[PDB]
Symmetry: none
Subunit: 307 residues, 2 copies
Amino acid sequence: MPIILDSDVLEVAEYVYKTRLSQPYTEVGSEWEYNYKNPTATFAKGDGHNLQRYITIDGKQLHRPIHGLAHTMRTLMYSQLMYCSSKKQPSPHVCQDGRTIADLSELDLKKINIAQLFFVAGRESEASYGDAYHRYHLYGAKQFEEYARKHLTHLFSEEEIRLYSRCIEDRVGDSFDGTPEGYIIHLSHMIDLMRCKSPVEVFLGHSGVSGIVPTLIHLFGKQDGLDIMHYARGLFAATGEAVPYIDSSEWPHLGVDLSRVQRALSIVGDINVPGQEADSKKTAQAGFSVDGCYSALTSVPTPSWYE
Amino acid sequence: MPIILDSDVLEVAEYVYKTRLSQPYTEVGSEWEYNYKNPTATFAKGDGHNLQRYITIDGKQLHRPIHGLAHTMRTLMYSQLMYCSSKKQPSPHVCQDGRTIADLSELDLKKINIAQLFFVAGRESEASYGDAYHRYHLYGAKQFEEYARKHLTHLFSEEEIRLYSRCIEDRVGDSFDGTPEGYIIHLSHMIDLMRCKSPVEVFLGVSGIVPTLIHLFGKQDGLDIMHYARGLFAATGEAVPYIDSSEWPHLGVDLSRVQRALSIVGDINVPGQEADSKKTAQAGFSVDGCYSALTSVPTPSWY
């Protein structure tokens, strides 16, 4: 059964793409370089500002390729998938407000999809150290609020605009599971990180923190958790992104506490999945238009259990 | 006679450059700083993560300058040059598998050059310590296997993919001289270390880098290989360290080691050169640019 983004959602997608996700990053250049060994004159307070600013595909510049339309749109698919899975779980995760994702309605998922469109829209570079991250999330929140108060007051109440603005903002001190709305926004973003993060971050965790895939299996069970993993990898391929290989025989040899590795192996199981190279055509099709991206996403089958 | 990189070697060079060597390092930033007074505060388990991440030249960031395209391509010149010298030696070094460099063919040197292009491709920072080294070599070995099984099966057999993958992986416990393939890979990487290591490591020593060359290839060929390397450093824009043996007694190394080094290498004085940003960029930002720079350096008369 397909995961559908309706005309209202796609209308907002067009707005976000036009006003934000298609735009060049602006906190870039020599004025934004950083040096850890020796302070220097700069605007930056950490690294990352000049990474992955744009790629060129058939002579056309795709700005912000790692946080652009495809990344954004993929996350809207994940939330709908996890909403289905949570509703099947004997004890879904209770968030700080006493509510679970299974407490959400279909209308709530529409509102969450709309907010997810803005989640990384405020970025002005790839920088991801705290100060930059927080500023960029505040900027995206303000972009959401401005649009919502002009165009979405028939759909969002005032309390809802405040809740979703805050979910986007991700203020210092906020909890990852504050509300189910915020939780699913964060989890969706986490899933998409598999495309760029190491085996350590995806499967093992650092010291505290669990790997991405083990989180999914903790929440959704092994079957649905691995199925959400595979689904996302499918969307990566459909949208032209390199699909990392997965090889659990490599895990004991990455420098991680073996206690930690063996825990990962017992949760995930032995796993071996081939990688795939990036496809520039598919990257441009998914990056340069809402309809192009959405067609790519819709090409990928959902898990058999999705309804 | 020139050292030639074949068209297929260059094809693989382009791929490794686009996919890996051009790309920014990832095990960088505030989560990878290290303070030994507080060893587990971040993800780092040692020093170096945030060292020489990139250099900006004429407005363009040249990522991983220490372990980039020019470092990698220079190593392929060295292996071809050591293969020629090995064939002149009366008793080339027998590796753990019973074979020597002189046992290799020209086709094995091509395969060796292709594996050499992945040798540091898996690095994700300048981190110096074992855990990071070994993870980075495992990553490069798997980047080579993935590429080779998709694109190189017309050239490499499955046994060869396994061999060269293991050469790049450099697993804890592996022998430096396990096979002539891996030996020559390791020797070529060490040659390139001359550009960044102290005269202690280069001359005095374990055996110093230059005395190792002289033990294996004779003093004439060994010093010629050292000089050729230093030529490729200059052609690619790298700073060329001075050599002054008159300083060797003043470095805090014991005298007996200094004497040994002078007995093997001889007195030696060679001036340094400063880095050249334009040549660094030319050699760092494209395969063709790098290969042109490497070709400009005359090879030893005996090559």
